[PDB]
Each structure stands twice: as structure tokens, then as C-alpha cells.
Amino acid sequence: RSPEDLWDLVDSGGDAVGGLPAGRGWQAGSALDGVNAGFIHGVEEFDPYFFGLDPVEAAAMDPQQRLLLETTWEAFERAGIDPVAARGSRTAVYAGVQFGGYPLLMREAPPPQVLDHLGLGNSVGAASGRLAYQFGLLGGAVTVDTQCTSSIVALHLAVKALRNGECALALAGGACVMSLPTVLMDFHRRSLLAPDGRSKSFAAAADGVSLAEGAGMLLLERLSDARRNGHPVMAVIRGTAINQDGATNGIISPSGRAQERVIRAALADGRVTADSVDAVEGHGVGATLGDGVEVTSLLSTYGQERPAGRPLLLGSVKSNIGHTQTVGAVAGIVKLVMALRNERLPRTVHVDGPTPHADWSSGTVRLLTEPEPWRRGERVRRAGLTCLTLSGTNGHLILEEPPADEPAARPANPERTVPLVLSAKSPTALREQAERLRATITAAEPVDVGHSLHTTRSSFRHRAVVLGTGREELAAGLDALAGDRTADGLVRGVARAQGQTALLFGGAGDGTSGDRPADAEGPRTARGLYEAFPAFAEALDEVTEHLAGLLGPEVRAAVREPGPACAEPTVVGQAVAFALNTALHRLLTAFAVRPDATLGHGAGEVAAAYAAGALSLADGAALVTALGRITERVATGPGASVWVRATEDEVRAALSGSQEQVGAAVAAVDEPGTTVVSGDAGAVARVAAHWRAHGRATGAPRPARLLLSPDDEQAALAELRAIVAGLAFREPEVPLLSTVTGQPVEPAELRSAEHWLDHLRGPTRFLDGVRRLRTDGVTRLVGLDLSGDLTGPAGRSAAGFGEPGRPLLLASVPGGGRPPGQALLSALGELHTDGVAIDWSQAFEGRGARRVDLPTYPYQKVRCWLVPPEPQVSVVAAPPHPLLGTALDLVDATGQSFTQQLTPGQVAGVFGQQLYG
Amino acid sequence: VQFGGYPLLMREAPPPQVLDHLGLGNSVGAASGRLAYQFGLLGGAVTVDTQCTSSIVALHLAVKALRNGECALALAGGACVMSLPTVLMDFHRRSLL
Amino acid sequence: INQDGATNGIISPSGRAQERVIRAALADGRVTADSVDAVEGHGVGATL
Amino acid sequence: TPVLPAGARLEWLLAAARHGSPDSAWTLTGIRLPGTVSAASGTPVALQTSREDSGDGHRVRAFVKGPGTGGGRWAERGGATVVPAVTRPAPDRVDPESLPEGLAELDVAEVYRRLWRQGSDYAEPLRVLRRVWLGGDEAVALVGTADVPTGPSGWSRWAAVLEAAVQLAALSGSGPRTPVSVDRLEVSGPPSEVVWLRVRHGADGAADAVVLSGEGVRLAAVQGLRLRPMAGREPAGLAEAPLERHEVVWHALAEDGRPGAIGGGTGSWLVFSDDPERAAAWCDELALFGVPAVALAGEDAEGRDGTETVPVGTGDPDVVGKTFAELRERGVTVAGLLVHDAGDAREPASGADDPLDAACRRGGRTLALVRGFLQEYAEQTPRIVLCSAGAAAGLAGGPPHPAQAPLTALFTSLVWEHPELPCAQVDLDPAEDPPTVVSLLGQVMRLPGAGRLAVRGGRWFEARLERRPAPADRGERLALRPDATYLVAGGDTRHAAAALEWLAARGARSVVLAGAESERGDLAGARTTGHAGIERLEHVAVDLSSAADVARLAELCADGRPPLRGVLLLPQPVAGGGLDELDGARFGAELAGALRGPVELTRRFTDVGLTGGTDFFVLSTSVVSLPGRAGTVVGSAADAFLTALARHHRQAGLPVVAAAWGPWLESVDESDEAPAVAFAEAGVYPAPGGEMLDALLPLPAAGEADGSGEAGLARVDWDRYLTAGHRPLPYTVLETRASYDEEKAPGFGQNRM
């Protein structure tokens, strides 16, 4: 199922020819008794749902179309190209295929549904069309037939298309499946098969040919374009030719001369010289005469020009796998490509001695009777294919090494976290990938595996992310995924296509609510992000070094080493909170998280407005520092605040109806079960006592949260109007909601010095803001929880909204995970899992990451065939005596009777006497 | 060229002297092979299929072969014969005609 | 030659592909579209 | 299973009869249609027919013959006497519009549903009724364009038109039935594109019919059509479904296990618990989230958070109804009810160890609650959540507690008796802290309709009923060890005789009939069939409700006989009863009466160590109790309790098993088949007790030490089971949870769209 599987077979010196396939519906009697051939087992099994095919059309498709379709996906995956990125490309397709007769299996007329799919399911020219349709490719898409040479002809045409600049990529190969037995019956009837079914390539033991199946596709590009795109190169195809035996007197060999011409034509096309070739993967099909003619034509070309001490090395993979018919040239390429990578030439099996039908006596050519080393070095390694056919279209290719595989010059690093990302089209295929991948992570570099997975593979509907630092942690996470058992290192889920996402920005001071063990640890965690994510470090300094000048360099120390002041209502705290909010927003957008709305609480509204694009970064810091100084006057003022476990309408009614309320008012309305009250410390404390007398809980006391006098208002309006008039406002990219209104912000409101003071002339209405995000379609909701635990009141106000039992995802980005990066990567992993198209590159940026090979997709195959599998073959019995015919069973008959019909061609066979003509 | 299904006209089995010629008589790859055999031509011989465009595709490749200098002349075209009625029956059944 | 590929029918995939192949054939021949007098179209008789 | 339609057989005889002639008018008489022509899906069929001319003028005799069964021989499947050239006039232009005048119209969709509740379904070419009217002992119909090949012109349309007459002849009846004979059939020409049928049941057990053209011309007539002599022929031998093992398997919600939102202002939540602090704390959590709620507890506890005190502990629904009626008089609107059970905490709270009485207490209380509340506000379509703890098999948290079992029975009773109400069972771990109430109601409100959910650790599971093959050949290889006694207990004589026959057929040398009838009834027939292989047979006449008579069974096997190695408590009948018809006192009495027998035996045999020395100890239950069924509350409760009790001993390492079987074929009464007819329409088919015992008994050596869940063994078609009864909203035990976010392209080759 891969080049490495072929290499393991070939390099171990095995063979793959065996007994006939069961489970194909073959009616064949004794006519194949004792025949051996190289079959693909399970060719009748396919995964229609992976390709989006209806299973009745997948039953109608010729197995050759199915193998091309399946093999093409795998070719893109090993090129390291996402097939979704190939859609709309100028990729051309060239497929060698022959009509296999698959519809002729049917014992009875087809059902009316499958009948309408048999046409495009079985046309030869439809095969390349179906590939280019499925993969959305725009180049030419042609099928070719020349019997055995069809694959080498497809490669030649693809090389000539790429050199002529028709297309950016070309995709070339073929398929061959014996869906019907008839070709085996014919080659057996005419005694062409070797009696044991082995193609004894070039051996004195040569006996005959041996049939086999196969499919293969190569993805091809001009070497200069491949290199500047940074693609992998497995080998170089350097030059190609086709010719024809034609016809002649037959005292000269047409094939002998024609093979000598095609070799010289291919060498000239490649602009190489015959002395520079090391090996030939010859045809060597095992016919007694043909193997002698081929070796003769090599002796008269390559065998005349050898360097001193360098015989041409000859072999053939057809000895390991049989003939393979239309794909013979692909099998030869896959062997040579793996031989180049492993730096060895494999043995040829079943050689008893070199065939007597050629003069080996020159010593300039020898069979690979034992494997030989083929190290990279000063002499550039090169090899040739031949492929031949009785209808006379010959071909030859020259292959060459890849360019030098230059190392990364790889740096040392601490073990920062790696996010492995997996996805599949169904849950079982997800767990299959976890098993396949575990055999790789236990050997390859974890950062290189992680960096490969997010870019060289497509993203499907069922998703998982595995986080860790050590190879053992990643292996433990993958094992838990494979076992379908939950572990904290991983995240699981299914992509909702709905994009609708919103982002929540906090002010500094709300950590006064008392959860300072979290609201100081959030900022300490945000310090940890500077070490792990370059986009954060740049963004933070682009606030800090730009705008610390408004406060003096003391704020730079507070930003670099955050502490309790970062959770407190102060100019420094407000500035630090704005800096860290800005840095996180620039980090999340570097991960390609895009908000469809923003909401900001208190002074966090400036950050939410900045993130909505409504301001420059400089305007933000100017406004934040003004609101910072106003906040100092309020927080240092004579008043107080409390929270009460009573809702707005309860508190407002009890407050307004009673006395002992003097100057106490509702400051915030953020979650259904509690509200915050502020004003005179006397009235505020007495309102709290009143609610404890009603048996409610209260949190108390705290500093003031509102303007305590119109004196403070007039001072603040004088300070704001001067500054607000100077800010370079512009209209937002995405809807910005305000906690002043609980509503979207208009152009004039954005520009209003009154509006910016209304954060201090409250209440704050965060509950209404979050409730509006959900009416307006927001499915997933992200907290910049550096202070006030802002996602908590968001969850408690969001979840009770209304009837439909909707999806709701709450994510906290500077979260509680112990290594600081794992909290952020876990939150991103959860968004990516739910369906956000996150760009993982920030986890791998600034590290020694290299692309490496990975397993390919695990199809979940099921039987797709026009007929049920046969019963046990014991059913068969002798034919009727030719003119006695079939015995009837008319039920009440007193003695048996029989009938025969003789058609005209049978009549002349049975009536063996003529009288008078 | 496209596979026409011609041998499927038979009701009886063929005589063996016909049977031995049905393979090369009906293989689509053999169609271009016969021409280069009969006329003794030495250039590459290719049979192509792309449904209705099969001829213009064959002609396009022949123009490229001549421009590349692969050959002295090129000989390009195609054929289509309804040896069986089944394609008319499909287009009539689906009311495409 | 080109394929019309596969996408939403609303943007006329065959229509766009036909416009591309015409421009490519002109660009291969080095001719310009004003210098063509007539075209022998497909015109198979299918209504759309 | 596919069958040849009776109208097609009746046409097949006519097609043979008219073959030799151009004539357009025909008569067939003395018609017979014995047996049913059928073919298991994917099998060839050979057909033969003969015109065995008697030489008596008109009298050609026609026969039709179906093939041998396997290597068997041809069999008659119809026969008729022909009379050509009918040569007599008939009435003309009989107004078709006069036919419906006395009669009420029916929807054709309900007509084909009525026939589906007679086991019969039809392909589109036989769904040829277009309008139907019915009244008293007759029916009439309009038949559509019956467009058979050679039917719009040609006679083959008679197959469909005659099958429509059979559809109407069956429609007036009850119980599954099929034609047997026709006394006369008379025909003239092929049928028109429209025809009118009249069918009349005026004769004793037989129907007559007329077919008219759209103009009212006589096209055909039928006399003496009979179906009754093949009403209720055995559906068990006809049904396509094999014997299989059915299991309630818990699947983790690994994908998509995020709770989502809660319904907000659309009502309020009633929260009842055994613990007033739990109901209070969950009302607090709902209040934090802005969801209005009320805390309730039984009158056994104080108003510890101003909680409503409910007269539960009285078995009566009506005082409970009056208690909620006061809440409706406050103006309360209910979104749903949450009932929370204490789990095993009743054991330290009471100091008792009485699992059957604990089940009787729980069920009695919870019925009074649920009925009393449904009687008051079911019109609001309230959601119901029944929160058990430690009820679930097949999961972590140790063995299930059998005293929980009334809750699963009560849940499935709501699923089938009030299918308009969305509801769920949640099973908690009994010893871990319960999850946040928002996690419960969120995860529940993912479900339209109904389902069973369980929580262990932070992880959510959903139950699915799923099915796998059952190797009966293990029972062919099971030789019962010869140096041993086996018990057959508690069954009626029909089950006992079949079990005894299976024991003899498996080499059992010593047996005791531990039945109540066993040493008092005429069991000489049972002794006779037993002694076809049983060397030693003995009988007890045991009352299984008596600890003393159960102690007599424990004195046996200790009495020096060949030592005990198998025990089988056979199936038993249990009284019918829904949620309606029932109250908590009645439930406690009936459940105690149902369970005491098998409980006291299993207990006593385990206390004296005859259990575990025994290789195979089996308790009977119904497969129907896995998804449950309407009107069988106590039977479901008993089956659930024995399932949990069996697992409690199995997790203690003992070879005790509860078998959840289909109906035994030998237990189908020949006198009145109606119980088996009801099962057959519901897609449950009887099977031989010996084949089920063969598929079951050797298996306990395989372990399956947790992951088996609730398990059973029967012939069932769950698609019939689900579509029988009635249910608008999905039920995730039987059915896939939901659709999900994907859609499909127009595909290759399409110039369209």
C-alpha cells in the first residue's frame, strides 16, 4: 500500500504471486485450475462516504476508477500537499487505463438505479475526467492506451506537458485490475503463462509470462518550481522517449533495432551520456526469446560505453510481483525511487543463472544476483527503465538523484509545548489515525511531527488536539485517544460550520470582587506568554515602548513584572490591563481567531473598541490614562460598594421604596443572581444589612465604583472633552457593544465625552450585552480573563437565555493550566475543535521545525461489487451430452424427458457427416 | 477511439479461428498499433480517450509532438461506429435526443 | 485543452472554462482575437 | 419476508386459463389458494403450471406449483376449474357515484397503516387504493392507474385490481389473515385506468365483490372469497428475523458532550428530592443562572429552605395532585420536573438491609409523585427528569443497587404511555458528588423526545440497545456433567416440560422439578419425556413464597444425591397495569408478590453456598423489558430488579445470570394465540426454549465481567417494535441520536444544478 511496503517486499527478496481471488463473483470452472497470478486482495472493498459517492454509484464504478481515485489522494498526501489547496489549480492528469469489462459480471439485468451509473462508471475516458472532477483540477485530463506501455506513455506525455509549460503540476500513472478472469483463461489456453506463475526475469530457467494487478500515481513538477515552493523531491525524471517496432522482413529483429533506437533517443532527450547510467530496471517479463533480445539491445547501447570497472547492473521487479500489465513502468519507478533513498540496489529473485540467449562474455552488463550498495557521492547516481509490448510501442526513461537534502542547521531549545492536530471524516477513522501516528511519535521529533500535521494534511469534521512537552506525554495522549478514553492532555469534538464568535475585554479594577488569587495569577501567566509566543512579545512592546512615555518608564516594570496593582483601580493597573488586553488580541488574531463582535466591561471598552478597529493604539492609551486618573479620584473617594445576592428589580425596588438608602445606587448588573451597589458607605452598608435581614448573602465592604458628586462629574467632563476631541476615531470593522447601554455603539456615541464618562455614571449592564450577543447569533464566546474572571458572569448570564438548548462554548484564554502556554493552547484547541479555522503556526514559529513523512488516511472500507460472493466451488458438475440436453421435471410425468436447442454453429459441429454436400 | 463493444453482437460462442483474433481485433490500444504496423511507421503510436473531445485531444498531442521535434510527420484523428444499439437506447431512454 | 473542474453551478463552471481555453489557444498561437473571422462552435443542440 | 400477493396468484391461474384463446370473457370456479408462496431475501424461485384438460367441454383444470423447499419436491400453491365464454348479459351503467352514499370516507394512509398492523406491507405498484369509503359490513373504493407491464392495455392489471379487493376484504377484519378459496370469479376484458370496487361481508365468514369501470360497466365479480381459515397461522415460522443477542450498551459522549443552553423564561422548574438541602442547593444554582425554580420534599422532612412539603409516602396520586393544584393556584407555570433519589443513603438512614422492601417503598412514593403531578399539569407538556443513583449496569462505581429498579421501569412507562412528553432518566454515581444542576438540565435539553443518560467522574454516557449474533452451536457442544443434579423451578408445566426435554437432550442424569404443581399435578407426561434420558427425577410441590419450602429445596442437594450444577428459575406471568390503573400501595403489593419467589430462593441458595458450587444459575426476565413497553409497569420493575440483583452476585464472582428472553414457542397457546399475535404485530417473534438455552447456557465461563450491560436473547425486529405502539419524538435507546452538519454535491457527469 506504499513505496515502503514495496521496498520491504523487494529488499527482503520475497514474491507476491499466489492463488486465485475468492469473493469476486467469478463463474470460472476448471479452466483456471492450478493457475497462479499477482492479485490485489480486497479490491472489491471501498469507502464511498470518504469520496462523497453514493454506494450504488460506487458499486457501478469499474475497480480501476476506484483505485485511481484512492491512489490519487494518497499521492497528494505524500507530496505534503493539502488536496483542498489543490482545488482550482492548473494540474493536468494523464492516466493509463484499459476497458476491464466489469459490467459483464452481472448474471441478471441491473436494478434501474445502478443501470443509470454504469456509463460513466465504466467508460475509459471518464476515468481521468472523474479524477479532475473529484479533486477540482483545471488542467487537461486524458486517458491513454498502448497495452503494457500505457503507463510509460502517460509519464512521457506528462513530462512533455510540464516542459511546454501547459500546467503547474501533472499527475500521471495508471491502473490494471482483472475484474473478469478472461485474460487469465486466454493466456492459460495459449500456454503463455510460466507453469508456476513466476516471471523468471533474464534467468536460464525462463518459462513464460505471469499476469498481475496494480495501480499507481506520481505527482510531478518542474524541478525549479518544486524547489522555490519548498516541496519534497523523491527523484528526478530527466529524459524520456517512445517509439514503435513497426514491421520488417523478420530476418532483422524489429524489436532489437527499435529498442536500440529508443534508448539513444531517451539519453539524447535527457542530455545525458550512456556511461553516466549505473543501473537498468529492465522489462525482463520472462518470455524465453524476449529476455535475450532485451539484454542484447542493452549490450549494444550501454554495454559499449562503460567506465573502467563499472558494469551496467540489470534487474526487474516483475520477478517479485509478476507482469502488472498497464502499470509496469510505475512499479519500476517505485523500486528505483526506494533504491535511491535506501542507497542500495535490490536482488532479482528466481535467477538460477543468466539466460543463454545473450552473450554476457563481454562482462559489461550483469544481473543483480546479490544486492549491491549504491551510496550518494561524487558520481551522480542515474538509472533507466524499459517497457515493451507485442504491438510494438516501446519506451525508456532516465531517472536521477534528488538534489542534496541540506539539513536545517537545527538550534537547541527548551521543551515548549507541542500541539498535535488530528481530524477525520468519521470517529473510527480518528482513532485509527491515533494508532498509526503512535508508531511515528515514538521515533520522529515531536515538534517536526506537530509542524507536519497542521500543514501537510486536510482538516475534516471530526477533530482532536493533543498537547504535551515530552514524547511520552504525547504518546500517552494519543493512546488515550485511540482507546476512546478521556485524559486532560487532549480535546475532542465535531466542527459546527457556523462562524459566529465574540470576544470579551475586561477593565483592571473588577478583581476587587475578591478572586485576586486568580486575577493576579492571570497576569503572571501572561508574563509566561512572552517567552512562548513571538507575536505576543512584539505586540506587548509595541504598546509599552510606544506609550509608557505617557506615564514614565515605571509602567514598563509593572508590565514586565505584573502583581496585585494589575487587578486594582489605579492609573498603572488600568494601563497594564490595557497593554495585556492589546497583546492578547494581537496574539489571538495571529492564531487567526477573528471576532464577529466585541464587548468591553468598564475601561475594557477602550480595548474592545481598539480590537473592533475604531481607534489607533495611541488614542487607546491616551483615553485609558484619562479614565485611569478619573478612576483614582473615585477609588480614593469617601464612598463604598457591596455585592448583594438579589437581582436588579429586587434591589432597585427595596432600595427605592425604603429610606436609609441616601446616595446608594446600583453600580453593576452582570449576572442574574447578583447586583453591585455603591455610594455613601453608611447607606451602602445599611442596604447590605437590610438584605441579610431578608436572608440573602452579601460581599462587603469595598471601595466606591461611581461618581459620588456632580463636582466630580464637571471635573471629569473638563478633563475628558479636551482629550476625547483629540482622539482619531474611525468606524469599527465589526459590531462593538457597550456595557453603558447593553447595546451597539453608534459613530456619535463613540465620539461622545458623556458616553466615556457613563462608565462612571452607571450602572454597568454586562448582562444585557451578553444576552444581546446570543440573540444576535453568537455561538462561541472568548474571555480575556486577566481580571474580574470576565467569562464567569458571561456564562451565568448567557446560559439561561431562552428555549432552544443551543450550543454555547465559553473559553478563558490566559487560563489555569500549569505551564503558561498550555492554557492558551488548550483554549485554542477547544475553539479549533468546535470549528474555528485556527492557524497553528504560532506554536511552531521560532523553533527548529522540519517537515517529515506521516501515515496516510485510514479508509473505512466496505464491499462494493455488482454481484454477491460465490458459494463454495463444490457446486460444479459435468456438461449435458450435446444432443440429449437438459432433463426436464414436469411434475406429474410418468417417465423422464429431455430437450436440446442446437444453434447453427453447434449444428455444423455435431452433424460431422455430409451426404451430397 | 472508444471501446465499441463489437464482439457482444454474438449469440453463439465464436469459432476458435475467430476467437484467437478477437483480442487484438478489439483492444483500444491496438487500434493505433495496427496503423503503425500496417504502414511500417517508427514513431510513437498512442490511442486516447476523453469522450467527445477524443479527436481534438489526439490532434493537440500530435501538434506538441511535431513542435518538440519528436517526429518527422504525425498522423492524427479518430473513429466512432455504433456497432451496438445500446448508446442510442440510453439517449432515447433518458429523452436526451 | 482544459478541464471545467468542479464548483457551484451558479458561477457557470463550463462557461468560465470555455473562456479560459479560448484565451489559452490564442496565446499558444501568438495570434490576437480581432484577427479571427469565424468560429466553428460545438453547438450540439442541447437547449442551455 | 417477501410473499406472492393473493391477487397475483389469482391472476396467475387466469393467465394460464386464457393462454390458448383470443376470447375476452372468462370464469373460474372452485378456486383454492393453499399455503403461502414466500422466498427469503436473495433466493431463486422455480414455478410450474399445467392445463390438465378434463375433456368435459369448457372444463380445463388449471394447477400452479411452487418449488421444493431446498432438496424437497414441487407443491401445489393454487388450482382452479376454467369455464370459458361466459355468454350471458349483465347490468350496465351502474352509477359509481351512487356507491359511496351510505358510507364514511377514510384516509388511504390510515388504510395502509391498518394493514401494517396486520403484519402486511406493500410496494408502490400495490399501493393502488386512491379513495376508500367504509360502513357496517361493506366497503367501496376508487382504484388508481394500476400500470403493471401489459396492464394499461393487456390483462396483467388484474393482479393489482384483485389485490385491492383482497386489501379491502382484509381491512374489515381483525387479526392477520390471508385468502384460502374463492367459489366463483367471473371476468370480462382488461380493467380501465380507473375502476370502482365494492366489497361486502354479508355471507357467514366470506366476502363478495364487484369491479366496475369509470362509467359503471361490469368488469368482474367475485363470490365466496374466504380468509378466516388462514387467520392467525403461525407468524413465527414466516418472519424473516433470526435469533440474536440484544444488549443495552453505554456509549461515552466523547464527541459533542458540551451541555449548551437552558430554556430561560418559558416556565419554571419543580425540584423534588429525598434531601431538602439538595433541592435547596439546586434551586440556588438555578437562581444564580436566572432560571426560576421551586424546592419540594416529602412530608417526612421539614421546610428547611421554605420547601414545599408533599404528601408522598401516601400511595395516593390525588392528595399529591391537590398539592400541586395549590401551586397552580399561585399561578406557577412548569417547564419541567426534576426528581432526585438519595441513592444508597437510605441504608444508613434506616439501618435496614431489605432490598425488595426498599424497592416497594421507592416505587410507591415515586408513583404517587409522578401520577399526582401528571394529573394536574401534563397539559403544559412539562419535561420530566428522573435522577437515580447507582442504577446503571456496565459502568464504573461498583455494582448497581437493586432497590433503584422501580425508577427505570417508571421511566420506560412514561416513554411508552405518555409519548407526547419529553423525558429522561439520569443515573448518578451514588458516592461521588453530584454534578452542577446546570450540567444536568443543559445535557438533558440536548434531547428532543427521550433517552437514558449516566454520569461517572466528569464523563457522560448514553445507553443504546444494540444487537449481535448468538452461537447456538455452543449448546450442541455443551454436555451437562453426568455426576450432577439440575433444578428446574417456578415455571408452568409448558415451560417445565420443554426445559426438562432440553436437559434430557443434553445428558442431564439427575433432575428436580422444583415447581408448585410438580408433586400434585398429572406430571406423568413430564416424567415420561424426562425419562427418555433422565435417570433420576424428583418433584417437590414447592411454594416459592415460603422460606420453609425453599429450605426444603436447600435440604435437597444436601441429601446425598449427585451434587448440584445447574439451576433454572423459569419465566412467569405478571399482571398487566399502566401508570394509570395503578397507585403506590397497589404497586408495592404487586411487586413484592412478583419478586418474593426468585429473591428468597436466590438468597437462600447463596446463604447456604449452593450458589457458586452451581455452574449455571439462571433467572428469567423478558427481552421486552430492555426498551420496555406500555401497560407492564410491575413486570418491567421485577425484570429490572432481577437484572440488577444478578449483577450484584456476578460482581461478587458468582455464575448468576438474568436471561431476558423472547416468548417461548412451546408457551404459545394453541387455544388463543392473542398474546403471540400482539407480540408478532409489535415485531417480537416466539422461538424454541431449547434453542435459546443452547445459545445461552455455556457462556458464563467467558467472563464479560462488566461491559455486557443489560442483556437478552430473542427474535425481534426493532423497526417494527419502534413503529408499533405510537411515538412522535425520537427515543435514543432504540434510535440514532440526531442528524449532524453535512450535505452532498450534485456529483460527476451532471450538467444540471
Numbering used by the authors:
A (entry chain A): 50 to 966
B (entry chain B): 146 to 242
C (entry chain B): 291 to 338
D (entry chain B): 967 to 1719
Provide passages from the article that reported this PDB entry:
Here, we present the cryo-EM structure of CalA3, a chain release PKS module without an ACP domain, and its structures with amidation or hydrolysis products. The domain organization reveals a unique “∞”-shaped dimeric architecture with five connected domains.
The cryo-EM maps of CalA3 at overall resolutions of 3.38 Å and 4.55 Å were ultimately reconstructed. Although the two substrates were not observed, the resolution of the maps enabled us to reliably assign the individual domains, dissect their linker junctions, and build atomic models of CalA3. Similarly, the substrate tunnel of the KS monomer traverses through with an open end; however, the two-sided tunnel of the KS dimer is intercepted by the F148 residue pair that forms the aromatic-aromatic interaction with a 4.5 Å distance. The active site residues containing C197, H332, and H372 are conserved, but C197 rotates approximately 143° relative to the same positioned Cys residues in the homologs.
